Structures are given as structure tokens and as C-alpha cells.
């Protein structure tokens, strides 16, 4: 049986549930794929440029998580699909010996939303996850505000047409999104009274972290604001990545069904 190797690059990487869900798919779909994939967690040094490792490990494809998604966009040979406008890559595939970058966070976030009744959004964060979410939400015709602590990174969000803040804007937002970078989200991302204000006027508190209740979500829950963690995004984005790992042979809906079941 033909073997191919995949993994997910991050630091930290111990928490990632990508190997669980991708391995479940590779084991089921080996029938149709006519190879058996195995998918590994891969801890990289902070300074890594990724490509050397990808090639040394003989990977066919990989995912990229914190804090490497912007670096992946820089180091891949070719960027395809909506990643062209995300400034960030979360999926790498070796295609004809070119390292090709995609971004499945954008659509995976969109698919994860139950309602499309949302008109505007405040994204907390400025890393690869925030960039893909801003791209996607602007594409869907929401107004997007982005709140962070420095002037670095602002050109991307301003070129998208986002309203960029470093002090929390006195406005109501339908979606309030914790996409803070290089963070595990164990800590409130804003002053608690400020977040309470947003939650009381907001329609959904959405936190990209998955696999525990963050204090951000717990505050929304206490306030009876509807809230959503990162599980359904992870699973849709992973299923989309799996579609790419299959050379578009297995549709994401079929990967999704397997992944959700095992998760
Ligand atoms: O936790 C994980 O395994 C992942 C989380 C998201 O950042 C993804 O975009 C990434 O591809 C994988």
C-alpha cells in the first residue's frame, strides 16, 4: 500500500486535534484514494521557515497553526484560492514539486456559522487567524472592525477596508470574535467590563479556541449571550484541507462527516 506523510506544524502543538481527525479520514478513504496517509503533530522552533522541515520529513501535505500561518504565506512557492487575499496560509500541499499554500480557515469559519443574520463584526486579534476571518467577513458583506495593540499589521486590514482600532470602539457588534494570536486564550482578551458591554449588545461571542471553555466564552455564557467555540471551525477547515490532501478527490462534506463523528 502506497504511503504518504502529513502533519500539522505549530508551537505549541500538543493540544492539536488535527491528527485525530485526519487519521480517521485517511483510514476510511484509503479505499478510494489508493494510498494510506498518516498525519503527525510537528513541533517547530519559533524561528522555523517551515519549508526545509516539510521537505526533510517527506510530507505530501501539512497544516499550519499558531504562530506560523503568516510565515507559511511567505515561504510557500505558490498561493492558491482565497489564501491569495488572506495574507496567511494554514494548508500546504506538494503539487508537482511546488509547495502550494491554501487557507481553509476563511471558509471553515463561514461554514461554522449557524445564522447568516449578522451584519457587522469586531475581531480581536491581528495574526493569521484574524486575517483570514477579516477577509472572509468582508467578502460576505459585513462591516468589520479589528482591535489590537500596535500599528504593525495594519496595512493588511486597512487594504481590506476594515475599521482598525487600538482602543475598544464604542459601538455594538453582532459578532464579537476572539482571534487573538500567539495565545491559548486562557485569559480575557479585553477588560472584563468592556467585554460585558459588547456581549450585552452583541448577537454571538465566538472564540477560535477549542477543547476547553475559555474565560471569554464563560463570560458570554454568564450573560446569556449566545456563544460558540472553535470546534466546528476546526472540523470544517480540516475537512477542506483533507479535500486538498486528496487532490480534490474526496469532497470536504464527506471528510467533515467522518471528522465530526470521531471528534
Ligand atoms: O489546531 C489545529 O490543528 C489547527 C487549528 C487552525 O489554526 C487551523 O487553521 C490549522 O490548520 C490546524
UniProtKB/Swiss-Prot annotation:
Keyword Transcription in record: no
Gene assigned in the entry: aroE
Documented EC number(s): 1.1.1.25
Residues at which shikimate binds: 16-18, 65, 90, 105, 210, 237
Example GO BP: chorismate biosynthetic process
Binding positions for NADP(+) per the UniProt entry: 125-129, 181, 208, 230
Alphabetized UniProt keyword annotations: Amino-acid biosynthesis, Aromatic amino acid biosynthesis, NADP, Oxidoreductase
UniProt pathway annotation: Metabolic intermediate biosynthesis; chorismate biosynthesis; chorismate from D-erythrose 4-phosphate and phosphoenolpyruvate: step 4/7
Family, similarity comment: Belongs to the shikimate dehydrogenase family.
Signal peptide region: none
A Gene Ontology term for the protein's cellular component: cytosol
Subunit structure: Homodimer.
UniProt GO MF annotations: NADP binding; shikimate 3-dehydrogenase (NADP+) activity
Any matching Pfam family: Shikimate_dh_N
Role played: Involved in the biosynthesis of the chorismate, which leads to the biosynthesis of aromatic amino acids. Catalyzes the reversible NADPH linked reduction of 3-dehydroshikimate (DHSA) to yield shikimate (SA).
Protein name per its UniProtKB record: Shikimate dehydrogenase (NADP(+))
Organism: Helicobacter pylori (strain ATCC 700392 / 26695)
